[PDB]
Design a protein around this nucleic acid. Structure first.
Lengths: 274, 93, 92, 270, 260, 258
DNA sequence: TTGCATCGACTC
DNA sequence: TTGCATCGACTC
DNA sequence: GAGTCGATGCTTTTT
DNA sequence: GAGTCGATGCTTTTT
């Protein structure tokens, strides 16, 4: 017996959370094992991202198998954001990564890309003859205004974007954590590098933040506010389930790759074929 | 109208054949068909009524999150389990 | 579209490999929801790894009966054609 | 273990042909048994009509079970038409059958019904102030014209409607046989009596012919001609499969009951 | 009018005649046309040829339990003879013909002409008299009787219920053999066996119910089997099915309308 | 630059430091910050805490086979350090810098004053080298053949597979992208082939010939094990990083600091 | 005194 | 000289 | 089929 | 689960 390949991200469930057990390989399958000896088969190849919560212990084999089927593993903390990840050793095509690099390296192409990013964000072309930093400024302003608007809309006390080494900020942060998950998954599936960004740069998930930022507020943040409305003991779960529901309902996984391609396309340079 | 599968184990011949009134048996204890909701439920009532000490699981295609849903009747080592609204299967030891 | 796969006396390699993409609700019985291409690659997996065991696969379609199915390897229960309707004959 | 009920005809496959074996009950299920000892499970409750061909031998139990699930058994001959049938002992409601009887017995209501039947046939209301017999004349004429037209359309030599104690006539006859099957099934499922007709009368399948006749030419006959075009050794099968395909594709089973209700409704009665 | 019961064998054809076949060979020859109606009991199988022949001569096949104690199926579904059914319908529709039938039914039931004045009061009189009859049989046979009870009971009520079920069986058989529709009744109406109840009711208490009391008595391993078997034996032995047809014909005849 | 191999145990945390655990208790303590990169070999499991700590200090975890003879996975997918990758990209894009790197590569492996012709000369020498090792070790050699072969070609193929393993490991540890190559390009391991090719024939291939000789129960196993032992014993992975840095340095462009 | 079918119990 | 996982063979 | 508990071997190659 | 081969009983009621 020989072969094994990844399946398209399109066909997958967005993401699944595992907690308190060890994840092993049993007869070529990915399995969660409880303290009482409960096995639980997990269709790893049918998920874009697996989120490992505290108290989880991952076998070498499990990670190797998860990589072979092109599923991203992401270690997440006490209700926390993304802490770490493991995946496929790299982009499947040199051409794609190099394409991303050209676009990134020369400031004019970069300008074109960011402007498209802005357009996609707001439904409006960005003002003419403005540098990268200034567009950054407009973003920041507009974003603040948007948090204020959702707070207003949903009747939520909002005291700014604030972060913890407050309910509202945790809901937002967890939601974004999930979105950075899927966005990273897509970026890797597409064969590009998460570290090479256009707006954000110099950080390991720059491109992930760039892409996630585009669809963050039509998708994932509104419900963060709505859930924030409720004041429950354990927010996280409801947020997770709601994000699952939004990703399926709004076709997120399917759309993510096209969006990335169109974004990079705006460089007016030719993409390598799939 | 949607695809239906039913899997029986250690169930009396009465039910074994009765499912076969409406369904097709492609292997022992495994039936496949295509039915409306009401028929699915009446079949379920049949199973619920006649499954003795055996156990049985039924799944059908839906337009939900995973694409399908399922329930069991009686006891089995393999049992459904919930992971954040996703329904999977835990293998009891 | 909804997919079901049923294996008998098949080696553990395949037993687990189907479980990479599908859910095991009973021994040898897997259920999922997949595109055509994935269904076929799964079929290629099965066709490749089924030893002396045998296996049957059925999925929902928009055809006459509402679904369609094929087997690999030998079984007493075997598909049979009655005027374009596909049913099952039980050998002795 | 106790209960059992019929399922709606709507949900069923039109019909299935069985040949050369015995049909028995095994553990409460309907089973075809071959000479070599092959069992074959048949979802009887999931079929509106089972057609028994020559060389078939039917257990008492099989018929009793087939009746309990409201599936009509019909004995068919050497490529022949309907020869016999067995079913549910009768209509499930006195009211429906009596409704049919009133409509039938008084000639004016009858007139209304036949008129609607005609309308449904041709897409045109029937001429005013004409008796039953005259309408049946018009029918005969138009029908002849229609056979001539399909013959023309499909390039088929047509020498009239002719019965055998010629390919074209066999295809037609087999197709109509099948249609009389499903029509009878529907009529019984609806709880009415096949013997009480409006156009045709005094014969055991009068009402069946009445109802089948309405949709016969939009549905089942054209392909009889197309198949007749081909000159094969064994026509029957292809005709059967084509009729299966037409019944599913054109939602025949689902439509049959509404049609019957609307027809009888035209009596302007409760 | 002629009919035959066949049991434990396969029905086939020899030289265009009906034949019953066992492991013992031919058990009964029936020359084609000798019989209007064939009643097939449990343990039987039907050849294709047999059905084709039965159709050729228009013979009605009816699948039943032993002696007709239940009716499972019939050929020629919904009645084969339009005229008879239509005759029944006329009679049933007309207020007045209906009155007249029911009155005849009542007469036949007692040997007494029914009181002059509507259908409902006769319904009442019947209920009363029936109660009195249960009381009388209870008396005659020394049986504790605590009234009419039947949720979906007591021993006596189960025996009665099973017996009536069986009588409805044979009555239905006769009604179908005669070529009439069980759903079109005169006293009872609106339900699938109205006419069956009408006719069964007339001869309920001569034979079927008395045995129900006697069996209720003897308090068996238990009731329903023995009651059913006893009714089987009585129906066969006393030619009940055959005698049911004249009664029906006379009843409907009373309408004073031209029988076919 | 510092890296450690851990094997047959679970990696966890004690007082904010990394620890390897078996049934015997603690096998190895690693104080946080002492190591840039941890290579996890088969038979290992990773605690949540260990990953959270490794993230906190930005330590790279890389799942590999024994001694890095294969690479299965890496943390920080697609490289964690944008600057290094971009450095590699700059070098790769500019046809002239590229020339200059490839020439250096050749020197390390001085090149004739003109990329494609160098490709040609390499092919020729390489054949000559196979012929020489065949000669040296007394091995029948019937040319370059590889279809998915002869014993010698299987041993060679397996050894190279393994070398691509460790080379990839080094490339990822150094924080560069395996897909961006200079000689080879357009394919997922171009840079890995580039670097592996340089030191292929010093050690990895000779043993392939010696094992090919011995005509063993199983070559692929023995070849892989032999390569494992050589890579560990001769510090191959560690020594690969300087070579890479020098190669890219040759571009005469400002390397990023550490 | 014939037979079809469900239900037992004991080894594949 | 430590370990995770596949593959055997022999009884539930 | 699914437990065991011994065996083995961290491997399904290629530029 | 799926063969057998003995056992039983043609039956799951109601107007």
């Amino acid at each position: 017996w020989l072969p094994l390949n990844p399946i398209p991200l399109k066909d997958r469930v967005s993401m699944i959370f595992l907690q308190y057990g060890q994840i092993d390989v049993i007869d070529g399958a990915f399995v969660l094992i409880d303290k009482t000896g409960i096995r639980t088969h997990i269709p790893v190849g049918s998920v874009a991202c697996i989120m490992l919560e505290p108290g989880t212990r991952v076998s070498h084999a499990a990670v190797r198998l998860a990589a072979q089927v092109g599923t991203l593993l992401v270690w997440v903390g006490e209700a926390g954001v993304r802490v770490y990840a493991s995946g496929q050793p790299g982009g499947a095509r040199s051409d794609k990564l190099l394409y991303q690099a050209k676009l990134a390296l020369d400031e004019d192409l970069r300008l074109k890309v960011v402007r498209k990013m802005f357009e996609l964000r707001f439904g409006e072309p960005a003002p003419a003859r403005r540098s990268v930093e200034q567009l950054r400024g407009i973003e920041g302003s507009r974003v603040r205004a948007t948090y204020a608007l959702l707070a207003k809309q949903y009747g939520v006390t909002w005291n700014g974007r604030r972060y913890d080494p407050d309910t509202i900020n945790q809901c937002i942060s967890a939601a974004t954590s999930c979105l950075y998950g899927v966005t990273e998954a897509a970026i890797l599936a597409a064969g590009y590098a998460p570290a090479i960004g256009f707006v954000h740069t110099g950080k390991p998930l720059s491109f992930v933040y760039d892409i996630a930022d585009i669809i963050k507020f039509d998708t994932v943040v509104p419900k963060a506010f709505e859930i924030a409305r409720r004041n429950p003991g354990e927010p996280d779960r409801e947020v997770r389930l709601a994000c699952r529901d939004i990703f399926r309902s709004s076709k997120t996984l399917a759309k993510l790759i096209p969006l990335i391609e169109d974004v990079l396309a705006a460089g007016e340079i030719q993409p390598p074929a799939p | 109208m949607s695809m239906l599968v039913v899997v029986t184990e250690n169930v009396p011949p009465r039910l074994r054949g009765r499912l076969a009134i409406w369904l097709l048996e492609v292997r022992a204890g495994v039936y496949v068909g295509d039915v409306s909701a009401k028929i699915r439920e009446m079949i379920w009532e049949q199973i619920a009524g006649l499954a003795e000490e055996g156990n049985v699981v039924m799944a059908w295609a839906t337009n939900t999150e995973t694409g399908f849903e399922f329930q069991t009747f009686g006891l089995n080592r393999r049992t459904p389990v919930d992971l954040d609204g996703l329904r999977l299967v835990s293998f009891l030891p």
